[PDB]
Design a protein around this ligand. Structure first.
Ligand code: BCL
Ligand SMILES: CC[C@H]1c2cc3[nH]c4c(c3C)C(=O)[C@H](C(=O)OC)c4c3nc(cc4[nH]c(cc(n2)[C@@H]1C)c(C(C)=O)c4C)[C@@H](C)[C@@H]3CCC(=O)OC/C=C(\C)CCC[C@H](C)CCC[C@H](C)CCCC(C)C
Ligand SMILES: CC[C@H]1c2cc3[nH]c4c(c3C)C(=O)[C@H](C(=O)OC)c4c3nc(cc4[nH]c(cc(n2)[C@@H]1C)c(C(C)=O)c4C)[C@@H](C)[C@@H]3CCC(=O)OC/C=C(\C)CCC[C@H](C)CCC[C@H](C)CCCC(C)C
Ligand SMILES: CCCCCC/C=C\CCCCCCCCCC(=O)O[C@H](COC(=O)CCCCCCCCCCCCCCC)COP(=O)(O)OC[C@@H](O)CO
Ligand SMILES: COC(C)(C)C/C=C/C(C)=C/C=C/C(C)=C/C=C/C(C)=C/C=C\C=C(C)\C=C\C=C(C)\C=C\C=C(C)\C=C\CC(C)(C)OC
Ligand code: HEC
Ligand code: HEC
Ligand code: HEC
Ligand code: HEM
Ligand SMILES: CCCCCCCCCCCCO[C@@H]1O[C@H](CO)[C@@H](O[C@H]2O[C@H](CO)[C@@H](O)[C@H](O)[C@H]2O)[C@H](O)[C@H]1O
Ligand SMILES: CCCCCCCCCCCCO[C@@H]1O[C@H](CO)[C@@H](O[C@H]2O[C@H](CO)[C@@H](O)[C@H](O)[C@H]2O)[C@H](O)[C@H]1O
Ligand SMILES: CCCCCCCCCCCCO[C@@H]1O[C@H](CO)[C@@H](O[C@H]2O[C@H](CO)[C@@H](O)[C@H](O)[C@H]2O)[C@H](O)[C@H]1O
Ligand SMILES: CCCCCCCCCCCCO[C@@H]1O[C@H](CO)[C@@H](O[C@H]2O[C@H](CO)[C@@H](O)[C@H](O)[C@H]2O)[C@H](O)[C@H]1O
Ligand SMILES: CCCCCCCCCCCCO[C@@H]1O[C@H](CO)[C@@H](O[C@H]2O[C@H](CO)[C@@H](O)[C@H](O)[C@H]2O)[C@H](O)[C@H]1O
Ligand SMILES: [Mg+2]
Ligand SMILES: [Mg+2]
Lengths: 318, 274, 45, 268, 47, 344, 47, 47
């Protein structure tokens, strides 16, 4: 039995790191950093500090308003019963506006609250995105986080804003609930003929599978070479060590090709962003330009034809 | 044929079976004994799939379908053109997947690496054998496995999902999806983090170390897991996604037959709020 | 880390502004009651 | 025309799919170019370079290092003479060490020519330091302190005792164990954290339940106790160089094949 | 009972107690609002 | 998990092509319980196929059983007492076959149950005659008796009322969904698809007929109503979606099992009986809820909106793909054959 | 009661109190909007 | 009352205050647009 580098056996404690000095024009960091023993078992023990600039407080306030609108509406749906609130929490939702209103502003009685929560949640997410951009720039680091985040926002925006805008109805958008938004997801595929046959849904799943596959490969590869300092990836990129060589050689000998320490994270970055990028395009296509994906599959020779175990059933409604 | 740093590592030993006889390379690929068995099972399985494609109605890549036998055949071997070919390919696939994992073990030993990658691949193999062996075994028929076709097995997923009227309500499926979503979210963050420090915002800027990596996430989300933690967590999320996927499909049918939303009535009928 | 003198001074301002908040709220509640009282009674409004 | 239709059979979804196929093909081509920034150009088993063209092999990537360390070029070619000989003549054959592969840096014991300077924090001081050089850092309470425990080899024989802990300043974690050798020619030896297992009464399932450890200590299954004496020695005190880190960790990596020989030869 | 403050830190105890009391008060108000009899805003008739 | 628990061994019937996963895996132990629950009671005595005085001549107040021989008329009276009147919890004055009758004179329609029973006599014969496309699919169907939808209870255990319209509130709008409802499998799907499809004439179809968009106005919210209705149909028949659909091509009738066509007739027939036989009962059933036999113990005769308890697929399938597992109970009771032939 | 500020930091107490007060005010306004009688924007009749 | 700036940074408070005021103003404008009576764009008839 050898050490598998799953949990840190010996943690050390010292002064907390306050972060690299930010350039002038930045707010002071908030919070007093502390050490969490159980977090240090897996990774860094230090919790905080956090940066709360104008973007952070504005995004928190906008997100707080959206959550409060959702939560108070779900609480009101169970007659303000906290017992029924907890019991029915996965089933409750802030329902999207009724289809009769189209894109017009709906009353509070028929989905006006959903539009406000969607607006404030979108503002919170957008303000969080620029904060992700700003925090990277202020440290001098590249803005890879912000643009990977933009891909996730892209699917979020098409799901609740862009596609309902194209369909001309806020009713096409996702309810703010746990089970109801699963119902919407199931109903969306059912309405547009088996979203399995959406080729961009296929692509999104391939990248979602690939992203999970890549992190399984990359996480295991780095842990298997962490005995040679493989976890210090940026140091390996600048100054290649035997950990990078062993990591590349393992995959070169396995599947005939390999990446570098830097380029594997380019594979990781692109596979993740392509999951939501392809997914957002696929969602944007259905209802606007394709209305039955299975029939699109049979039109393009995608859907298999199965042998008839029963005679074809005539539609009794003529 | 060799990377500029590859020559020193191309040494003997580390094999499990065969030892010296199969210890060589063909181009970039290491062979080993399990590489030969991987090639044997891969060629046999691929050839039988192509043969089933040739004997099928169409050569359309999306429409090629090697279906499992009928449920009436139970756990026995069906005729080759009535699902028996699928059964043979399934054995070849399992032989190829296990040989591939064992080949990775030999390469890991030869390089002094840990066995994390073959173990992580074992979770993927476990999900496949759950879909193709364990769940059909618990249901009593090999015809419960998914067919071998690019689009036919997607139809299988849809029909199995709707065999429980709402597969989103499956509790283990809910956990598995969240892990799949979490590992992609973590992968995007981790790839972005490493690229951000190795590719600074201003071109030709000093490269950033782990302090900037920690500081950005502490500035951004208030916590940084560190370079070691993200690979531990990323592997954990990916393996949890694979593991809970096997759980979610193995409990559908063998241990739950009704609609998945029915299952949540235990929570609604708890004596604290009944 | 507040000394006793500053603690008294904060409390003096805190109490005064708390009264101002409460007095404005009291007026708001008196106006609300004159509009629509919120205690039903046996018949229930 | 139908709303999605383009040419009777062509529709918007189909051409959008083909647009992505073009982009994906370009992305895969771009990603493979990034994969070739290290390890290329390829060379034959005898060292003769292979032909790479230009559309695949990208221009060298120059990283400007911090702390005034200059600039680093990806694809550094190691200059040490390889003490290996091809077992057979045909390409793809393994290579046999013309000496002791454990000390020569061959196979699992291979070490790359990393920088001969210590890793530095952003402030500019050494990242990896012993606990004797910085009392501001200490082992965390609730975790067994390796300092004092005896280090056992793979064969179960005692190899020495921990004398100090080398920690990373950036990430508050133990990086190396300074082991005072039980056998002396005070010769100290560095054991990387990932190559050792702590078996004290505070690890887990022992602090949770309260069970004392039967045989507490540091257990190293990578090397036998006899091979601990040959672990590469750091040149200086209170400072470990990145090249010295590589050689120590490469020596442990080759131990399972060359020291204990449990990976040497087939299992069955 | 005055010696409990040698064990409990008065600052953290007051923070936990004040937070607990408000959450309980909101919990109880919300419970009554859900009931037909004690919903003072809906004004359902008694008996 | 359930009682009996779902575990190996299990039974599986395959309806579609191999590998399409068009199958139903069910608990054999739960099936044995259901088969015991759906056992058909034996007839009291064989049918009186002989002739004799007509019922309308012997008895004065006969409106619907006018074609019955006086011996057939008495046989039906005895059987419907076993099928509708529960022998447990009934008030003393409504026990036996006094449940629908004044003991002093039987020609008096004093209890509301007698007037209701007259309507159900016409409804049962209308189902058995004009809706054979569902209950007698090709001349070998089981048909329907009073026991089929009553099962010995005064009120069928599976009924549905129109969901009362929620108060228009500025906060907490739920759109008739977002609450766990047992009828739709404890999901968040719309709680009342029954009024949408089993009361008014709305086709539960949302899927477009062509690959590219055209004049299809169905939105996601109204497919959730279809989804809720189909969840009830699957739950009410104890089957899954693949019993009637190849879910990859859900709208394709050419890929659907023949059970889907019969289920379509069930939707039309259930809608018709709800509109022509169940809804008009509101003028007959007393609204006081104290004039109901046994009070509310046997169940609510009316809903919050004052509507009659309407008929579901679950009403008299009762979580079985065929009522009473397809047992031919109506064959032994020719009195309830309106115009269809259910012999053998 | 001035001694409460020897324990509680006046700054974080004011931040907590103000955030506390706004949430409660939003709660009550939302609850009144959810009722028929006290929804001033919709203005249903009394009695 | 001028001492409130001894405790809170005037710049940071002004940023927080202006953010709060605009969010509340948008919230209230949005709520009115979600009412029949006070939607000045829809222009429903009074009473
Ligand atoms: C019956 C159901 C249908 C189906 C219906 C849909 C629908 C509808 C969609 C998908 C989508 C996807 N489907 Mg699908 N899908 C089916 C079957 C599958 C199967 C399977 C094996 O059966 C798999 C693996 C998948 C997997 C996938 C993914 C590839 C893709 C989602 C990408 C993603 O991660 O976005 C998830 C992340 C987001 C959506 C948001 C990203 C981040 C945002 C910004 C989060 C903000 C957080 C916020 C601030 C938190 C506070 C909020 C408040 C508390 C409220 N589907 C079947 C056929 N599927 C999505 C897609 O794009 O595909 C084309 C999609 O819209
Ligand atoms: C590449 C695509 C994948 C992806 C990537 C991705 N996601 C990202 C990012 C990236 C690269 C970010 O940088 C960003 C981030 O912040 O990551 C840490 C983010 C993020 N992805 C998130 C979620 C998320 N990602 C998802 C998916 C995915 N993300 C894809 C798989 C999903 C899914 C599957 O649904 C979710 C749910 C967030 C964790 C984060 C963006 C968070 C954000 O925008 O927040 C804005 C601010 C708020 C909403 C604040 C609200 C909460 C406050 C606590 C309100 C209350 C305030 C106050 C405390 C009130 C006090 C009240 C009491 C007094 C009563
Ligand atoms: C469990 C965590 C995730 C994971 C992990 C994971 N996968 C892995 C690994 C790891 C750690 C490897 O090391 C290994 C590898 O080598 O990666 C490059 C691998 C791998 N994961 C792969 C694919 C893969 N992983 C998937 C998923 C996942 N892998 C999980 C999400 C999927 C999904 C979800 O679809 C796929 C397709 C391969 C690229 C590779 C394993 C290669 C292998 O087994 O090589 C030997 C076999 C062949 C070369 C061919 C065999 C062919 C058969 C004989 C016939 C065909 C049988 C098959 C059933 C046909 C089915 C067809 C239809 C489904 C269309
Ligand atoms: C911030 C400051 C805000 C203060 C608001 C406090 C509100 C208290 C108002 C009490 C006034 C009672 C009026 C009254 O007289 O209520 C009477 C019964 O009171 C009764 O027993 C007594 C009713 C007492 C109800 C309240 C009990 C708890 C309140 C204490 C909370 C402390 C914190 C009955 O009234 P009716 O004539 O049937 O009404 C007819 C309706 O159409 C209009 O009301
Ligand atoms: C004190 O606090 C208490 C109440 C506890 C608060 C607790 C609240 C709780 C428990 C809340 C629970 C919330 C849950 C469970 C939420 C679940 C949300 C889920 C699962 C959402 C999933 C998907 C939703 C999506 C994709 C919605 C997207 C919506 C969008 C993109 C809306 C965009 C709207 C815009 C941009 C509006 C613009 C305004 C316009 C332009 C229309 O103005 C004219
Ligand atoms: C009681 C009066 C019934 C109601 C209400 C509904 N159904 Fe029915 N159904 C009924 C009978 C007596 C039979 C048996 C006919 C026979 O073949 O012997 C059926 C049959 C079906 C079937 C066919 C089952 C099969 O395996 O082929 C289906 C699919 C079916 N019923 C569906 C169905 C649905 C969906 C209903 C609600 C809308 C419904 N039925 C109502 C009696 C009654
Ligand atoms: C299923 C389709 C049914 C068949 C066949 C028959 N009945 Fe029925 N019956 C059915 C329902 C859903 C209800 C409830 C209506 C309500 O408002 O509650 C009934 C009700 C009756 C009653 C009234 C019971 C009472 O209020 O005490 C009677 C007396 C009755 N049914 C008799 C009856 C007879 C005699 C039938 C066979 C001829 C019969 N019903 C068939 C559903 C169905
Ligand atoms: C038989 C008893 C069925 C079961 C079980 C399920 N469905 Fe169904 N479905 C059935 C019929 C007869 C019809 C036609 C309805 C009509 O009035 O014409 C349907 C229809 C649908 C549709 C709409 C199809 C369309 O053209 O738009 C959908 C989307 C649908 N069904 C989905 C569905 C699902 C998801 C089911 C499992 C839970 C399911 N159905 C079960 C008959 C039967
Ligand atoms: C064993 C007990 C019962 C006996 C002896 C009995 C006897 C009779 C008799 C003799 C008549 C004809 C009355 C007349 O017109 O003069 C009759 C009619 C009727 N009975 Fe019954 N009955 C019994 C039980 C029931 C029950 C339980 C129901 C209800 C389910 C019922 C429903 C009716 C109805 C509706 C009529 C009117 C027939 C018509 O209008 O066509 N009876 N019964
Ligand atoms: C984030 C910003 C997203 C901006 C998206 C680009 C602009 C989209 O432009 C928008 O397209 C949709 C789709 O035709 C139009 O939508 C219009 O046609 C649809 C067709 O179903 C009608 O139902 C709808 O009533 C009508 O508004 C809008 O009138 C137009 O303004
Ligand atoms: C390796 C090199 C690539 C090998 C793949 C060759 C692909 C040839 O592509 C070939 O195109 C013709 C049209 O011209 C398709 O022809 C047909 O396509 C699909 C069915 O498959 C139908 O929806 C379409 O109506 C019909 O034209 C063939 O299905 C396809 O096989
Ligand atoms: C995990 C690894 C073990 C998997 C389970 C194997 C258990 C054996 O289960 C048993 O298999 C043999 C095939 O060898 C079958 O044996 C026989 O069954 C039918 C009879 O017509 C034939 O189709 C089959 O080919 C024949 O061998 C049994 O019907 C089955 O019950
Ligand atoms: C379709 C034709 C290619 O499409 C284009 O190809 C380039 C090739 O680098 C790729 O673009 C990619 O590399 C470029 C540098 O070249 C980087 O900015 C970035 O990593 C990414 O955009 C993408 O694939 C796509 O933007
Ligand atoms: C690896 C996972 C563990 C495998 C070890 C065996 C676990 C028990 C499985 O036992 C398996 O169960 C199935 C159904 O679930 C049963 O097999 C059943 O299927 C047939 C249909 O094909 C049924 O008609 C019949 O009830 C029964 O024979 C057997 O009992 C056995 O084949
Ligand atoms: Mg819904
Ligand atoms: Mg309601």
């Amino acid at each position: 039995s050898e050490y598998q580098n799953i949990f840190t056996q010996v943690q050390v404690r010292g002064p907390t790191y306050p972060g690299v000095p930010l350039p002038v024009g930045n707010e002071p960091r908030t919070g007093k950093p502390g050490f969490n023993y159980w977090l240090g078992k897996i990774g860094n023990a230090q919790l905080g500090p956090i940066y709360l600039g104008w973007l952070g407080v504005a995004s928190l306030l906008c997100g707080f308003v959206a959550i409060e609108i959702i939560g108070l509406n779900m609480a009101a749906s169970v007659n303000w019963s906290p017992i029924e609130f907890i019991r029915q929490l996965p089933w409750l939702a802030l329902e999207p506006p009724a289809p009769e209103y189209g894109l017009s502003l709906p009353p509070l009685q028929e989905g006006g609250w959903w539009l406000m929560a969607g607006f404030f949640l979108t503002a919170s997410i957008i303000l969080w995105w620029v904060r992700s951009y700003r925090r990277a720039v202020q440290l001098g680091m590249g803005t890879h986080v912000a643009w990977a985040f933009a891909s996730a926002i892209w699917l979020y925006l098409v799901l609740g804003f862009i596609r309902p805008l194209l369909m001309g109805s806020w009713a096409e958008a996702v309810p703010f609930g746990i089970f109801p938004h699963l119902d919407w997801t199931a109903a969306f595929s059912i309405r547009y003929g088996n979203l399995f046959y959406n080729p961009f849904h296929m692509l999104s799943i391939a990248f979602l599978y690939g992203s999970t596959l890549l992190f399984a490969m990359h996480g295991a590869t780095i842990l298997a070479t962490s005995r040679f300092g493989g976890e210090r990836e940026v140091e390996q990129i600048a100054d290649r060590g035997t950990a990078t060589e062993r990591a590349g050689l393992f995959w070169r000998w396995t599947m005939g090709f390999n990446a570098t320490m830097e380029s594997i994270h380019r594979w990781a970055w692109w596979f993740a962003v392509l999951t939501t990028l392809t997914g957002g395009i696929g969602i944007l296509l259905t209802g606007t330009v394709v209305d039955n994906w299975y029939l699109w599959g049979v039109k393009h020779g995608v859907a298999p034809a199965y042998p008839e175990v029963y005679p074809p059933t005539p539609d009794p409604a003529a | 044929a060799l990377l500029s740093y590859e020559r020193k590592y191309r040494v003997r030993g580390g094999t499990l079976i065969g030892g010296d006889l199969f210890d060589f390379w063909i181009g970039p690929f290491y062979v080993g004994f399990f590489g030969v068995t991987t090639l044997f099972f891969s060629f046999l399985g691929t050839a039988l799939i192509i043969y089933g494609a040739a004997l099928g109605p169409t050569w359309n890549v999306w429409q090629i379908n090697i279906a499992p036998p009928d449920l009436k055949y139970g756990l026995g071997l069906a005729p080759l053109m009535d699902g028996g070919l699928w059964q043979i390919i399934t054995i070849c696939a399992i032989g190829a997947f296990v040989s591939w994992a064992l080949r990775e073990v030999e390469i890991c030993r030869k390089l002094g690496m840990g066995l994390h990658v073959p173990i992580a691949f074992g979770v993927a193999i476990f999900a496949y054998v759950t879909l193709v062996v364990i769940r059909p075994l618990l249901l009593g028929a090999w015809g419960h496995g998914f067919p071998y076709g690019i689009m036919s097995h997607l139809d299988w997923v849809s029909n199995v999902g709707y065999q429980y009227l709402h597969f989103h309500y499956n509790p283990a499926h809910m956990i598995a999806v969240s892990f799949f979503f979490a590992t992609t979210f973590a992968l995007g963050l981790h790839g972005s983090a490493i690229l951000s420090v190795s590719n600074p915002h201003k071109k030709g800027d000093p490269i950033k170390g782990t302090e900037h990596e920690d500081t950005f996430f502490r500035d951004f989300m208030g916590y940084s897991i560190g370079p070691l933690g993200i690979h531990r967590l990323g592997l954990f999320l990916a393996l949890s996604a694979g593991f809970w996927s096997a759980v979610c499909i193995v409990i559908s049918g063998p241990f739950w037959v009704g609609g998945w939303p029915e299952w949540w009535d235990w929570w609604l009928e708890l004596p604290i709020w009944s | 880390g507040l000394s006793e003198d500053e603690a008294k001074e904060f409390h003096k301002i805190f109490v005064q502004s708390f009264i101002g908040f409460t007095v404005v709220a009291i007026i708001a509640h008196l106006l609300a009651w004159s509009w629509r009282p919120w205690i039903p009674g046996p018949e229930g409004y | 025309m139908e709303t999605g239709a383009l040419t009777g059979y062509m529709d918007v979804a189909q051409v959008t799919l083909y647009v992505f196929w073009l982009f994906f093909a370009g992305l895969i081509f771009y990603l493979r170019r990034e994969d070739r920034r290290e390890g290329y150009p390829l060379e034959k088993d005898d060292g003769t370079p292979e032909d790479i063209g230009l559309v695949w092999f990208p221009k060298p990537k120059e990283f400007t290092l911090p702390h005034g360390r200059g600039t680093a070029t990806a694809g550094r070619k190691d200059q040490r003479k390889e003490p290996i000989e091809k077992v057979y003549a045909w390409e793809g054959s393994p290579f046999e060490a013309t000496g002791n592969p454990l000390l020569d840096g061959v196979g699992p014991a291979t070490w790359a020519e990393r920088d001969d300077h210590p890793d530095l924090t952003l402030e500019g001081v050494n990242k990896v330091v012993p606990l004797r050089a910085d009392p501001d850092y200490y082992p965390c309470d609730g975790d067994d302190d390796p300092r004092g425990m005896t280090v056992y080899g793979a064969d179960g024989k005692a190899a020495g005792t921990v004398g100090d802990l080398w920690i990373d300043k950036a990430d508050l974690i133990v990086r190396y164990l300074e082991v005072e050798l039980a056998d002396q020619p005070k010769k100290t030896v560095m054991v990387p954290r990932e190559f050792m297992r702590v078996k004290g009464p505070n690890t887990f399932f022992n602090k949770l339940i309260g069970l004392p450890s039967t045989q507490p200590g540091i257990y190293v299954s990578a090397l036998n106790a006899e091979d601990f004496k040959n672990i590469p020695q750091i040149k200086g005190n209170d400072q470990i160089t990145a090249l010295e880190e590589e050689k120590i960790t490469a020596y442990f990596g080759g131990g399972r094949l060359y020291s204990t020989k449990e990976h040497a030869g087939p299992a069955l | 009972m005055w010696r409990i403050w040698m064990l409990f830190d008065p600052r953290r105890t007051l923070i936990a107690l004040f937070t607990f009391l408000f959450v309980l008060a909101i919990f109880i108000h919300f419970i009554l609002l859900s009931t037909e009899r004690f919903n003072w805003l809906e004004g359902n008739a008694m008996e | 998990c359930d009682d009996p628990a779902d575990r190996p061994p299990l039974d599986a019937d395959q309806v579609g092509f191999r590998g399409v996963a068009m199958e139903q895996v069910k608990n054999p132990r739960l099936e044995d319980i259901k088969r015991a629950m759906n056992e058909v009671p034996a007839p009291l005595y064989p049918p009186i196929e002989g002739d004799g005085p007509m019922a309308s001549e012997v008895y004065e107040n006969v409106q619907v059983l006018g074609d019955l021989t006086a011996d057939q008329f008495t046989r039906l009276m005895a059987h419907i007492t076993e099928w509708v009147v529960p022998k447990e919890g009934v008030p003393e004055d409504r026990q036996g076959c006094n449940y629908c009758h004044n003991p002093e004179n039987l020609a008096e329609d004093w209890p509301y149950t007698k007037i209701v029973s007259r309507k159900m006599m016409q409804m049962t014969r209308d189902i058995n005659s004009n809706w054979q496309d569902h209950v007698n699919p090709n001349g070998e169907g089981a048909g329907v008796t009073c026991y089929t939808c009553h099962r010995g209870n005064a009120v069928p255990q599976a009924v549905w009322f129109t969901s009362p319209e929620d108060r228009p509130t500025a906060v907490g709008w739920d759109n008739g969904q977002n609450h766990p409802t047992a009828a739709i499998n404890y999901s968040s799907l719309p709680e009342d698809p029954f009024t949408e499809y089993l009361l008014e004439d709305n086709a539960a179809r949302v899927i477009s007929a062509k690959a590219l968009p055209n004049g299809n106005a169905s939105n996601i919210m109204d497919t959730e109503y279809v989804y809720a209705m189909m969840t009830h149909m699957s739950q009410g028949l104890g089957v899954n979606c693949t019993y009637c659909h190849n879910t990859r091509s859900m709208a394709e009738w050419s890929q659907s099992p023949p059970a889907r066509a019969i289920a379509w007739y069930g939707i039309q027939m259930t809608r018709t009986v709800n509109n022509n036989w169940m809804a008009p009962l509101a003028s007959v059933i007393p609204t006081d809820s104290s004039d109901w036999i046994g009070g509310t113990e046997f169940g609510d005769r009316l809903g919050p909106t004052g509507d009659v308890a309407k008929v579901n697929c679950t009403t008299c399938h009762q979580n079985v793909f065929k009522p009473l597992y397809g047992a031919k109970m109506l064959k032994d009771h020719p009195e309830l054959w309106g115009e269809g032939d259910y012999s053998a």
